[PDB]
Amino acid sequence: SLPKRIIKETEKLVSDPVPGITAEPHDDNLRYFQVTIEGPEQSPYEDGIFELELYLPDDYPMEAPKVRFLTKIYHPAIDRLGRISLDVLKTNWSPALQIRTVLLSIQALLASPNPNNDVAEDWIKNEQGAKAKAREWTKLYAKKK
Structure with a gap:
């Protein structure tokens, strides 16, 4: 039995999903989610699916x-380790x-890759x-949609 806050959030992910995003909690541990995010159209990631945990x-929620x-992935806000640069986190x-x-923030990050880190240097x-390299990596590493 988890906090009802977590149960409520989980139910809303199933019933009212966000287009291009999937989020599946695990039966053995309901605090752990496998997440896929589709590459936004008109972005260097357009053709790819991306995995997150x-x-x-x-x-x-504190x-x-x-x-x-x-x-x-080639992205100025996601390092080699897979750490994501979001102030919301x-x-x-x-x-x-x-x-x-x-x-929605991570999806937005893929939509608008903005610098401001050595990939951000490039x-x-x-x-x-x-932008051309990001597209190449999408073909190589991001599973086809």
Whole structure:
């Protein structure tokens, strides 16, 4: 028996899903989610599916979900380790936000790859080549949709 907060969030993911995103909790541990996010059209990731794992810590919703990007990807906000650069996961977190919020943010991150890190270096110096590399990696590493 989890906090009803978590049960309520889980039910809403099944009944009112977000187009292009899937989120499946695991029977053996309902705090652990397998997540797929489709590459947004008109972005360098258009053709690909991306895997993520997500975990709800004990202090949730006071504490942010832990997230790790699993698919290999060329992106200025996702490192080699799969750590994601989102303030909503750092300082901006509050119990008013949800899993949905985190997922919509990561989807938005793929939609609009913006720098401001050495991949972000490449995106500011000769960017049209970086966007081209991201598309190549999508073909190589991101499972076909």
